[PDB]
Design a protein around this ligand. Structure first.
Ligand SMILES: CCNC(=O)[C@H]1O[C@@H](n2cnc3c(NCC(c4ccccc4)c4ccccc4)nc(C(=O)NCCNC(=O)NC4CCN(c5ccccn5)CC4)nc32)[C@H](O)[C@@H]1O
Ligand SMILES: CCNC(=O)[C@H]1O[C@@H](n2cnc3c(NCC(c4ccccc4)c4ccccc4)nc(C(=O)NCCNC(=O)NC4CCN(c5ccccn5)CC4)nc32)[C@H](O)[C@@H]1O
Lengths: 379, 377
């Protein structure tokens, strides 16, 4: 088999999975109602760019690996467009990553900040900078101011796109920063799930232990110390908690009634009051947990969701762009074989097509809507 | 006197200093034919943007300080437009600095790359960049999501333009990046002189010595050893650089001096080598004339850049340095009213005196400014 026939056969397959995997998501949003929220409009817009990446961009990238006699400013257009469409995916994916940062770390402000209005404008900002970075060489910064005769060059990417443009401008800004942002967004969401866990479990253990002491502590002032450490832990739990505000005002009250029952000879009532506030028997503690729980198990999901996206985004775009930097800074030294460099192109067009499907299939509601269309409309 | 009455007074004074000095720069380039090159097209293009700053941006950046009752997207439009205008003064100053980087370190490809079509193009890139950045808040990244009633905010800058836009985005990319680039441009040009200076003052001295040897050089083959060093030095000088014609004859004359030196020393070596002394050496004399011309030409374009960078950092730093302090440390100590407003005036001063000082350092500009005065006056 040829070296070009294999590239095109594989490269055209990704274009199919591009359109297929992203219209199914574009199908599940148009059908299921509980998926039409703000977060998933970005998935609609990312899949919309991904379909433009599959329909229009991948054929324009195969066009570039041929190198036929064509005019400069025309062959420049082809390379600018595949740049434009590959800018849109990395930018729309960045919007989903930042949206998850808002609804998870700043939840009491998510409604009045990410409405349907600015979400329609955030995507409009992504596509505007895609056409700004994209159509930059067309306005001068290209490589034909001065084989096929006059006016016609070999239509390859490195021939019409300046390599310093790809090194200094395109990579450093449209792949590096978008990755270092989704990195910092994943990290601060990951770390947020780690701080909420350690303080809840430690507060918890102090409550059960102290109530365990008090119940089994007697003939000493240990009860006074145990109530003090219980009060402090309930307040630390109040600082993080926001139902939960009302219930915490009452837990503080029950510790005071506990301290008022610990005050005058009512040592058994102080033990009863520790039983009032002991986990098993407190309506407010149990309510406090399920909140502090539900957020943990939910945003650890959206943490691993980002861990998979960043782990896939860095994995796909860097090989193509790292090879670029060696060609510009180290052109005397060694290259990569003729097959390994085209794979760096294949991987680039993978992240731009299989990203909206991974985070979709990781959510249980998208996983149930997909099955309802495959069994019904497909068959 | 008022703290606001002096603000608009000082601001309007700067608005005129923009108008005159840069129309003067454009008055000069339109007169002299030899000023109509490609680099001074970037100086006119920059001088044109600084005229717009004093005509539109300064009247807009004052209305922004009043904090008057107006709809948000009306104060946004006044606030995004001042971000589009100051944008193009730093991106056109960047184009001058990039142009001066090419002409100095890569001169054998300057005219074949920086045509009037791509200079018409590069400037368009700088301007299309500004709209793509300045009109980001108008596309959503503003402040009126959720005094004067409903829908109308106190038309201040920080009331319509976010601060994560003016730190995470507008400073990181439109003050820090443009300034650090022109810093590296100055750095690579400043180091270009020391390397073109050394290897020549090396080649020249290696050449002076061996012939000064050859003059008082003894009988025997020691004269032949000295010629071998001169040939290698002449090859090094030919490597680092009409002109290429004079070296092949020079290399030809050293080989002409070589065979004669291989056989009879006393008489054969003296004629050719003595005419390789600067006096009877036409090709060395043409060669030294070029290096003397190029060396102190790029240093006056290196000091011209240390000034362009120094003036640029002296003004666009105090504004965005305070922007970062109010964004990453809003609780801690503030800069007072006048000092924060001074930083606004600073960032507006560079926008009216930056093409000037650079153009005024050009000697062809300096005569064209005095010819305008005597004719007008
Ligand atoms: C969000 C941003 N979006 C993008 O960046 C998108 O733009 C595309 N792209 C981005 N850099 C691209 C890029 N660098 C060029 C790079 C390279 C070339 C080929 C394959 C991978 C990378 C290169 C390396 C070495 C020399 C020149 C360029 N070469 C291409 C693109 O088509 N090559 C297909 C057609 N070329 C070719 O047959 N060359 C042959 C290969 C062998 N000889 C080599 C190797 C070493 C030295 C000299 N000769 C040169 C001729 N495409 C790119 C890509 O599809 C991205 O998705
Ligand atoms: C391509 C780059 N282009 C540019 O950067 C241009 O855009 C303009 N600009 C860029 N950041 C700007 C910027 N930050 C706001 C910053 C500041 C404010 C005033 C003066 C200098 C800097 C600030 C600091 C602290 C608090 C809020 C904002 N404030 C203004 C601009 O007009 N203030 C005039 C109208 N506001 C005001 O009276 N507030 C008062 C100031 C005093 N109280 C303070 C200070 C501390 C704490 C509380 N209260 C707040 C209200 N203008 C800017 C400026 O004209 C630049 O030339």
């Amino acid at each position: 088999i040829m070296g070009s026939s294999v590239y095109i056969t594989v490269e055209l397959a990704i274009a199919v999975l591009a359109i297929l995997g992203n219209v199914l998501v574009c199908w599940a949003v148009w059908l299921n109602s509980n998926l039409q929220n703000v977060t998933n409009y970005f998935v609609v817009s990312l899949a919309a760019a991904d379909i433009a990446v599959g329909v229009l961009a991948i054929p324009f990238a195969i066009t570039i690996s041929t190198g036929f006699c064509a005019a400069c400013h025309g062959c420049l257009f082809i390379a600018c467009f595949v740049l434009v469409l590959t800018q849109s995916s990395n930018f729309s994916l960045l919007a989903i990553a930042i949206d998850r940062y808002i609804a998870i770390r700043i939840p009491l402000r998510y409604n009045g900040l990410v409405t349907g209005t600015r979400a329609k404008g955030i995507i409009a900002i992504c596509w505007v900078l895609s056409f700004a970075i994209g159509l930059t060489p067309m306005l001068g910064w290209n490589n034909c101011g001065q084989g096929c005769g006059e006016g016609q060059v070999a239509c390859l990417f490195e021939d019409v796109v300046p390599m310093n443009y790809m090194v200094y401008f395109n990579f450093f800004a449209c792949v590096l920063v978008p990755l270092l942002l989704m990195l910092g967004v994943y990290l601060r969401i990951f770390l947020a799930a780690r701080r909420q866990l350690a303080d809840l479990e430690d507060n918890w253990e102090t409550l059960n232990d102290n109530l365990k002491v008090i119940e089994k502590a007697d003939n000493a002032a240990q009860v006074k110390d145990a109530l003090t450490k219980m009060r402090a832990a309930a307040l630390d739990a109040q600082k993080a908690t926001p139902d939960f505000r009302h219930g915490f005002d009452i837990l503080v009250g029950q510790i005071d009634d506990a301290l008022k029952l610990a005050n005058e000879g009512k040592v058994k009532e102080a033990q009863a009051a520790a039983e009032q506030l002991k986990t098993t028997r407190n309506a407010y503690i149990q309510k406090y947990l399920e909140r502090a729980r539900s957020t943990l198990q939910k945003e650890v999901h959206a943490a691993k969701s980002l861990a998979i996206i960043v782990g896939l985004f860095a994995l796909c775009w860097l090989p193509l762009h790292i090879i670029n930097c060696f060609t510009f800074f180290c052109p005397d030294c060694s290259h990569a074989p003729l097959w390994l460099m085209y794979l760096a192109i294949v991987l680039s067009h993978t992240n731009s097509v299989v990203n909206p499907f991974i985070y979709a299939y990781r959510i249980r509601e998208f996983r149930q809507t997909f099955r309802k269309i495959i069994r019904s409309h497909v068959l």
